[PDB]
Amino acid sequence: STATLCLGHHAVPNGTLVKTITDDQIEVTNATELVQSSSTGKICNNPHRILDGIDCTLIDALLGDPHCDVFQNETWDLFVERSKAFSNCYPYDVPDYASLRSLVASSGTLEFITEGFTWTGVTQNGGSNACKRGPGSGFFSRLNWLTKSGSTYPVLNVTMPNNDNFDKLYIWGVHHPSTNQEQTSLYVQASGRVTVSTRRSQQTIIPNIGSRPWVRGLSSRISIYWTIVKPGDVLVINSNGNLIAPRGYFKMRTGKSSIMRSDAPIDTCISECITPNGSIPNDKPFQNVNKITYGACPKYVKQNTLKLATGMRNVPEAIAGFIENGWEGMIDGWYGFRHQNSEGTGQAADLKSTQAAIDQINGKLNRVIEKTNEKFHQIEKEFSEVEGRIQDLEKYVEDTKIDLWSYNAELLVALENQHTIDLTDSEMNKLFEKTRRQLRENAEDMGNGCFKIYHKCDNACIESIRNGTYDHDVYRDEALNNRFQ
Amino acid sequence: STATLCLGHHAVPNGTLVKTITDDQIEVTNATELVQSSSTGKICNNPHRILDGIDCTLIDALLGDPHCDVFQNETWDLFVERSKAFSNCYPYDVPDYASLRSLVASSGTLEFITEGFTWTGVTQNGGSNACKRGPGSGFFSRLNWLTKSGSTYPVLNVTMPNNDNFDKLYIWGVHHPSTNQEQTSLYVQASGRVTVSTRRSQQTIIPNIGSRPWVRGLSSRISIYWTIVKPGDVLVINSNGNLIAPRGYFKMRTGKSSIMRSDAPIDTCISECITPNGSIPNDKPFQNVNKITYGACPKYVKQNTLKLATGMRNVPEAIAGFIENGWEGMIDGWYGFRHQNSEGTGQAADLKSTQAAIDQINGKLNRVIEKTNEKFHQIEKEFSEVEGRIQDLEKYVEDTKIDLWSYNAELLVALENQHTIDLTDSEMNKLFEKTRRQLRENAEDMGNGCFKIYHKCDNACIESIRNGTYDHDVYRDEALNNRFQ
Amino acid sequence: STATLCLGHHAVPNGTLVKTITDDQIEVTNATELVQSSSTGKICNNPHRILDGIDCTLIDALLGDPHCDVFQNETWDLFVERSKAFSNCYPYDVPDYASLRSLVASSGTLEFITEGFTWTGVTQNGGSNACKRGPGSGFFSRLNWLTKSGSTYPVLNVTMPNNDNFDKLYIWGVHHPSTNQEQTSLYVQASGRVTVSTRRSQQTIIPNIGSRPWVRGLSSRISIYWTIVKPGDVLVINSNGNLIAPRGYFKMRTGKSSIMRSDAPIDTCISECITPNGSIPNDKPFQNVNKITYGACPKYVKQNTLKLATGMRNVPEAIAGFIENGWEGMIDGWYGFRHQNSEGTGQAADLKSTQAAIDQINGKLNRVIEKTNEKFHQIEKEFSEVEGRIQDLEKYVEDTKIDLWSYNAELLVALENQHTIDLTDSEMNKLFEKTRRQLRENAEDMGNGCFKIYHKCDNACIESIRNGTYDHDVYRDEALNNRFQ
Ligand SMILES: *[C@@H]1O[C@H](CO)[C@@H](O)[C@H](O)[C@H]1NC(C)=O
Ligand SMILES: *[C@@H]1O[C@H](CO)[C@@H](O)[C@H](O)[C@H]1NC(C)=O
Ligand SMILES: *[C@@H]1O[C@H](CO)[C@@H](O)[C@H](O)[C@H]1NC(C)=O
Ligand SMILES: *[C@@H]1O[C@H](CO)[C@@H](O)[C@H](O)[C@H]1NC(C)=O
Ligand SMILES: *[C@@H]1O[C@H](CO)[C@@H](O)[C@H](O)[C@H]1NC(C)=O
Ligand SMILES: *[C@@H]1O[C@H](CO)[C@@H](O)[C@H](O)[C@H]1NC(C)=O
Ligand SMILES: *[C@@H]1O[C@H](CO)[C@@H](O)[C@H](O)[C@H]1NC(C)=O
Ligand SMILES: *[C@@H]1O[C@H](CO)[C@@H](O)[C@H](O)[C@H]1NC(C)=O
Ligand SMILES: *[C@@H]1O[C@H](CO)[C@@H](O)[C@H](O)[C@H]1NC(C)=O
């Protein structure tokens, strides 16, 4: 008699469509989504130290807004700026505001050391009713509003050496009165001047005595400037008037700190990736949640979905083999044998080829993508004002990055799916070729992916063929007799 | 007797060389140029609304140059800025000119709403002989040149609330007189000041009273500034002098609008992609025409040609099959059979494998590159002045983008050509293996991509082999007798 | 009798692990490092014109520091800016210093043409003891310190037309005296003003009368500004006072020039690639030395090693063929035959398949990566100050470029290694299939990448099989008799 041993691969009834280099949409047994398209809606407070700016802007906490005194000496890995954040202090503008916000966020600390600045001949601790600290007028806690003492405002000329071994951030301000009457009343000089300089840098501000929109009852402003005094350098403040002096310096730092605009609530949970939408799992290589990211985050891509073939071609369902169709009834392994001999039909999965395919597919993605791009401080990617050239450059850089990484994701997923499908096909063909080699002249490929063994092949001989210990010479005579006679 | 059945693939005499991962220049039956290296030289006026700035710069049309009154209330999807554009009005400079040009181009409209600004104690509608609107002195139509009324220039202090639901762009200016005599004659104050501010922003400009190069007969200038008033915000203009006030505001839009410097004529034609060279077709995924693009444009690459293999190998031309040579004489399909039997030689293309290869090759490039990157406003990529850091950053960002996308194009073309070649080879080999399987023991492969069938194979039998309905058992006895006896 | 003919591939005892798309670490016979991870520590003075700024900053050489007069009229392709560079002249700051440094580096020349500027009513060649040119007081050699002549400082008003065909760079300065007494003594005007303008540009600077840190004995500063005068344009300098006028112009160039901050000594050596680490060989496509590069440099990648498989899979060691193991003892070629016949065992490498594999592998890398991205002037990539938005954008652009190119290198190496391994496997399989085709029915594949030929196969017959001139019909009768009888 003649037995019919042959090979096949597992098939699933519910396949999943993936995109390859050669096929637009090919069904495979298994696939995994490589894009994190959803977020939990909350920012995890671990492992990063998240500082929620409930009603406070980062610059508001920096200056010492009366409603931002809880953020004094605060440190963060990510400062979260809520859209409800508002200023309740003296109206102010920060020329080059974005740079100050960026560098204070990167510093990651509001640690403020008060310094013994000596202001002779002027009244310190000038307050306002726009800045109401308690039941009375106040001002920014980190800024000293100096005004004329008596009937004269001398030329303040103070020095502060940076004898420490770290950069000192001095946040000072220039008062812009609404009228010349206010300018003279606060500062006997009809036109003030504030030159804050270091041995290498310099910033001169001429106060602007002009009316402007009422903000919290004031048509005067404070223009906020910052001076970074590196170690060994010295800060000289020379003011003829309109000086909102610094009460000290902020300890600048370098690290993984940044700032995020987000309304996502902070939740007791752990996630190394934070987006304005909330924290997302970084298990997947790519995301479609937000281009704004903090921590170990997946690369942002424009694709909502990128399915990676983690299985083989799905060819759902006479024991014809892989060339005809896949085997739905085989669950022990990926590739296996079905045999029909005198002892009845049987099946047995091939563990060697199954494990080869599984091992090859296991780390396919993780070996072409670095562990995870861990980004902490970045450029601004959403803007509320129309700034122009610099904002356009930031938007263009981010769009270029997004387009290039989205193309990388598309090409990589197509390449990896093509390689997975070709690899599973090659494993099936390799097992078929091994079986053919074992069955040198004792079998014949029926053409449906199925061999026809021309000798009585009991289950023991089937097992011998399956495990590679099949000796063709034993049955060569009988097989040849049944084949060519 | 016996028969011959050789399997082959179509070949063309006029092959085309392509680049693959494995071969530097491999000849293929067909290839398509993937780089749009040429342009029609004229900008299509569809589907985008192209506004040709014949003799006007965008800022010239914005300010209301007398020779640019045809651009009043103008809208555009692309503003074309001719190199012959010139200014014929009061000489002016725009501090951060690039930013204003960028944001006005992005806004995409010159829609100007005149507002009831009230300037008390000053003479309005000041004009100069440099701006000759008609037979007399004129000025920018969108700017009001305020001067002293009689012998006094009071402290102008006006407000304009933004009660609408859109951003208001206020283009104002500061007059820079040639001499103190002119400053006092126009503005009794010896030193003017223009503070234009919102509840959040502020811009105070001190006029510069100094002579400078004559431009249209004037050594005075206008420094042009813009204020964007968001909805609910209020614009306050406080001028001690030298105020070139706004006559209103330009309504700000957000959309696909931009500006292009181009001398390409406008043509009654349709093209979704516009370059300074002119409109180019976006059928190809890459273009080597211009890095400056607008609309649904191909990605810019440094390659002047990237041929993508849309066919298979050429092995140009005893009927040996694919292993030996390609078949020049087969035009019906890509793969086919040539048979020699007692009834004479014949040929027949294999439609199944041909269609498989054609379908696999049809969308190879499409299923790895997004439809088309539709970019509307971008960074400036060509610069006429040496600005320095920001211009260097823009040039670096564009050069990095160009290099990365050029590498992407090289790698993609090489990968897709390698896959096309391997795919056509695999189709040929799969057809050969199918024919082998059908001819289990009836035929022997002669090594030239062909089979020697050892039984009388009439045209009906050859057709049965070709269509897969060949029964080996019918001729097994005769074939074995002719083979082994 | 019979014979054995096993096909195999060369193996090396010391393989090298490379990385593929399918295997994390696969041993190949040969691999080459694609990342230049090391530098010679010195800057080659060829082929680039390296100018070593020993103790001079580029701006120090530009202004004409007394200790930088050796750099007058100097030209360079790369200006090397040592960390020991110091200023020994009048203390100064350059508002927008980075832009001036960038544009002077891009120009690549300090060629200074002295111009006949006429300053009437002021004292020229003003000096200080901060700039000691010799034993007496000095000043910047390219700047004229103008002061009051006698007891009056008239309103300087000079013009300089650009009648040449090149851009003229005018480096001027504004004096910032420490006290009003110094301002009046040097400049009778209590408040100076310096307006330097062209027909299209304008820079007006108000001198800053305020004290500041002593630098070389002076609490006064020079604010350095530059004006680029296009051909046909004219430069007008007006000054009430505080004018550090230009003595001429620096001739602008466009080309391959740039500036590098490096302490690597310049050595008599040739290298087209320069890094702050020193010159590196550009033979490899990628580097891990420095993201800051000049000349034809390898792309910077984060990977310190990327091994590209320049050989085949290594399978180190009855003459079983390729299926079992690789051939350690075969050095003549890559693929070969080992035969056992009545005349004894022998071996012979296959030159055709070996050469096919070698030719395909030779240029795999260089037909997908452009020769060398020759980058000369680009953005600053290392910053000593915390500047903010623009510096953050530069850092983000460079980090994006580095990440994208590192992913490109990783994916490219994985793809090329996968293709090389599949290529060598396919060459071995193609040799096996050719040998099978030649031995139509005279040999049987034993399953170990080897054939049992069932006829007397002397060395001549084995050579005929190896060179493709083997006629199966000669031995078909004997082989069939030995096979099936
Ligand atoms: C902040 O830290 C400084 C550091 O010494 C300390 O002097 C100061 O009292 C602290 N203030 C607050 C509010 O924590
Ligand atoms: C201002 O202070 C600096 C150092 O703080 C000093 O060198 C200078 O003499 C002072 N000037 C006056 C006028 O006091
Ligand atoms: C995240 O937020 C942005 C902006 O609010 C929004 O455009 C995007 O759709 C959000 N994505 C998810 C997944 O919530
Ligand atoms: C522009 O539109 C406004 C809208 O009211 C109108 O008042 C004005 O006259 C228009 N100008 C032109 C030139 O069409
Ligand atoms: C200027 O106008 C603002 C409102 O526009 C007003 O609050 C302020 O009192 C005015 N100032 C003077 C001096 O009239
Ligand atoms: C397009 O124009 C640019 C600049 O004028 C030129 O460098 C380039 O060669 C042009 N290309 C084509 C295809 O016309
Ligand atoms: C620099 O070149 C100019 C060009 O004429 C020349 O006049 C000047 O003397 C040169 N100076 C030096 C120091 O070489
Ligand atoms: C200043 O010089 C310019 C030419 O450079 C001239 O047109 C103008 O009249 C001069 N002004 C005075 C006040 O001399
Ligand atoms: C090159 O120098 C940089 C900065 O000093 C350093 O981080 C890097 O490790 C150096 N690389 C080599 C190869 O010396």
Side-chain angles (χ1 to χ4, degrees), chain B residues 159-179:
Chain B
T159 192
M160 200 57 67
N162 184 350
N163 303 133
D164 302 81
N165 64 7
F166 46 75
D167 280 17
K168 299 181 165 187
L169 181 69
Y170 288 88
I171 307 298
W172 48 282
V174 179
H175 187 225
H176 298 329
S178 60
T179 46

Short mmCIF file of all heavy atoms in Angstrom, two decimals, chain B residues 159-179:
data_model
loop_
_atom_site.label_atom_id
_atom_site.label_comp_id
_atom_site.label_asym_id
_atom_site.label_seq_id
_atom_site.Cartn_x
_atom_site.Cartn_y
_atom_site.Cartn_z
N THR B 159 -8.63 104.03 21.45
CA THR B 159 -8.91 102.63 21.72
C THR B 159 -9.83 102.07 20.65
O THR B 159 -10.63 102.79 20.05
CB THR B 159 -9.56 102.44 23.11
OG1 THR B 159 -9.56 101.05 23.45
CG2 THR B 159 -10.99 102.97 23.12
N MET B 160 -9.70 100.77 20.41
CA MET B 160 -10.50 100.06 19.43
C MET B 160 -10.70 98.65 19.96
O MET B 160 -9.77 97.82 19.91
CB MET B 160 -9.84 100.04 18.06
CG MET B 160 -10.78 99.76 16.89
SD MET B 160 -12.16 100.91 16.76
CE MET B 160 -11.30 102.42 16.33
N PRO B 161 -11.86 98.34 20.53
CA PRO B 161 -12.10 96.98 21.02
C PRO B 161 -12.35 96.01 19.88
O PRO B 161 -12.93 96.36 18.85
CB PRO B 161 -13.34 97.13 21.91
CG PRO B 161 -14.04 98.32 21.36
CD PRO B 161 -12.99 99.24 20.85
N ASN B 162 -11.90 94.78 20.08
CA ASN B 162 -12.14 93.70 19.12
C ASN B 162 -13.36 92.92 19.60
O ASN B 162 -13.26 91.84 20.18
CB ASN B 162 -10.91 92.81 18.99
CG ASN B 162 -11.08 91.73 17.94
OD1 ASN B 162 -12.18 91.52 17.43
ND2 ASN B 162 -10.00 91.05 17.61
N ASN B 163 -14.53 93.50 19.34
CA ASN B 163 -15.79 92.87 19.72
C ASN B 163 -16.21 91.78 18.76
O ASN B 163 -17.21 91.09 19.03
CB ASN B 163 -16.89 93.93 19.82
CG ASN B 163 -16.54 95.05 20.79
OD1 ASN B 163 -16.69 96.23 20.47
ND2 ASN B 163 -16.08 94.68 21.97
N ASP B 164 -15.50 91.60 17.65
CA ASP B 164 -15.81 90.54 16.71
C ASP B 164 -15.23 89.22 17.20
O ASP B 164 -14.60 89.14 18.26
CB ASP B 164 -15.28 90.90 15.32
CG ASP B 164 -15.83 92.21 14.81
OD1 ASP B 164 -15.31 93.27 15.20
OD2 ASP B 164 -16.79 92.18 14.01
N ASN B 165 -15.44 88.16 16.42
CA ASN B 165 -14.99 86.82 16.77
C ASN B 165 -13.79 86.37 15.94
O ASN B 165 -13.56 85.17 15.80
CB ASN B 165 -16.14 85.82 16.63
CG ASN B 165 -16.64 85.69 15.20
OD1 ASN B 165 -16.05 86.25 14.27
ND2 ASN B 165 -17.72 84.95 15.01
N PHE B 166 -13.03 87.31 15.39
CA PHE B 166 -11.87 86.99 14.58
C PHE B 166 -10.72 87.91 14.96
O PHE B 166 -10.92 88.99 15.53
CB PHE B 166 -12.18 87.13 13.08
CG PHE B 166 -12.92 88.39 12.73
CD1 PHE B 166 -12.26 89.61 12.70
CD2 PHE B 166 -14.27 88.36 12.42
CE1 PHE B 166 -12.93 90.77 12.38
CE2 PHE B 166 -14.94 89.51 12.09
CZ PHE B 166 -14.28 90.72 12.08
N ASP B 167 -9.51 87.47 14.63
CA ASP B 167 -8.33 88.29 14.85
C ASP B 167 -8.35 89.50 13.93
O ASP B 167 -8.74 89.41 12.76
CB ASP B 167 -7.06 87.48 14.60
CG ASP B 167 -6.69 86.60 15.78
OD1 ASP B 167 -7.56 86.36 16.64
OD2 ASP B 167 -5.53 86.15 15.84
N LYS B 168 -7.92 90.64 14.45
CA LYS B 168 -7.80 91.88 13.69
C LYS B 168 -6.32 92.20 13.54
O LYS B 168 -5.61 92.33 14.53
CB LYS B 168 -8.52 93.03 14.38
CG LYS B 168 -10.01 92.83 14.55
CD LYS B 168 -10.64 94.03 15.22
CE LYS B 168 -12.14 94.02 15.09
NZ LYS B 168 -12.75 95.27 15.60
N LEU B 169 -5.86 92.33 12.30
CA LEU B 169 -4.48 92.71 12.02
C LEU B 169 -4.44 94.21 11.77
O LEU B 169 -5.01 94.70 10.79
CB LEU B 169 -3.93 91.95 10.82
CG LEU B 169 -2.48 92.24 10.45
CD1 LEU B 169 -1.54 91.71 11.51
CD2 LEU B 169 -2.15 91.65 9.09
N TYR B 170 -3.78 94.94 12.66
CA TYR B 170 -3.63 96.39 12.56
C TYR B 170 -2.21 96.67 12.10
O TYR B 170 -1.26 96.44 12.84
CB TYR B 170 -3.90 97.05 13.91
CG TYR B 170 -5.35 97.06 14.31
CD1 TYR B 170 -5.90 96.00 15.02
CD2 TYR B 170 -6.17 98.13 14.01
CE1 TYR B 170 -7.22 96.00 15.40
CE2 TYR B 170 -7.49 98.14 14.38
CZ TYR B 170 -8.01 97.08 15.08
OH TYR B 170 -9.33 97.09 15.46
N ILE B 171 -2.08 97.17 10.88
CA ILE B 171 -0.79 97.59 10.35
C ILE B 171 -0.66 99.08 10.61
O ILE B 171 -1.35 99.89 10.00
CB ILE B 171 -0.66 97.28 8.85
CG1 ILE B 171 -0.97 95.81 8.57
CG2 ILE B 171 0.74 97.62 8.36
CD1 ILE B 171 -0.03 94.84 9.24
N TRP B 172 0.21 99.44 11.54
CA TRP B 172 0.51 100.82 11.86
C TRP B 172 1.98 101.09 11.52
O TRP B 172 2.72 100.18 11.14
CB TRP B 172 0.21 101.13 13.33
CG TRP B 172 0.77 100.13 14.29
CD1 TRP B 172 0.26 98.90 14.57
CD2 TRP B 172 1.94 100.29 15.10
NE1 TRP B 172 1.05 98.27 15.51
CE2 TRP B 172 2.08 99.10 15.85
CE3 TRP B 172 2.88 101.31 15.26
CZ2 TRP B 172 3.13 98.92 16.75
CZ3 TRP B 172 3.91 101.12 16.15
CH2 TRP B 172 4.03 99.93 16.89
N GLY B 173 2.39 102.34 11.66
CA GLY B 173 3.75 102.70 11.33
C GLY B 173 4.24 103.84 12.19
O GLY B 173 3.46 104.55 12.83
N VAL B 174 5.56 104.00 12.20
CA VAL B 174 6.23 105.06 12.93
C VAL B 174 7.06 105.85 11.93
O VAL B 174 7.89 105.27 11.21
CB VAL B 174 7.11 104.50 14.06
CG1 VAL B 174 7.82 105.62 14.80
CG2 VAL B 174 6.27 103.65 15.01
N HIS B 175 6.84 107.16 11.87
CA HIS B 175 7.59 108.00 10.95
C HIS B 175 8.97 108.30 11.52
O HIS B 175 9.10 108.67 12.69
CB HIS B 175 6.83 109.30 10.68
CG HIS B 175 7.45 110.14 9.60
ND1 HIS B 175 7.62 111.50 9.72
CD2 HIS B 175 7.94 109.80 8.39
CE1 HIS B 175 8.19 111.97 8.63
NE2 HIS B 175 8.39 110.96 7.80
N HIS B 176 9.99 108.14 10.68
CA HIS B 176 11.37 108.44 11.03
C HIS B 176 11.78 109.66 10.21
O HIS B 176 12.19 109.52 9.04
CB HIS B 176 12.28 107.25 10.72
CG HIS B 176 11.96 106.03 11.52
ND1 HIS B 176 11.43 106.08 12.79
CD2 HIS B 176 12.08 104.71 11.22
CE1 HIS B 176 11.25 104.86 13.24
NE2 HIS B 176 11.64 104.01 12.31
N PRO B 177 11.66 110.87 10.75
CA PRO B 177 11.99 112.06 9.96
C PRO B 177 13.49 112.19 9.73
O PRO B 177 14.32 111.67 10.47
CB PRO B 177 11.46 113.21 10.82
CG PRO B 177 11.38 112.67 12.19
CD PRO B 177 11.09 111.21 12.06
N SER B 178 13.82 112.91 8.65
CA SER B 178 15.21 113.11 8.29
C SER B 178 15.95 113.94 9.34
O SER B 178 17.09 113.62 9.69
CB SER B 178 15.29 113.79 6.93
OG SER B 178 14.66 115.05 6.94
N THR B 179 15.32 115.01 9.83
CA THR B 179 15.98 115.96 10.71
C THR B 179 15.03 116.37 11.82
O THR B 179 13.82 116.18 11.73
CB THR B 179 16.45 117.20 9.94
OG1 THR B 179 15.40 117.66 9.08
CG2 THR B 179 17.68 116.88 9.10
#
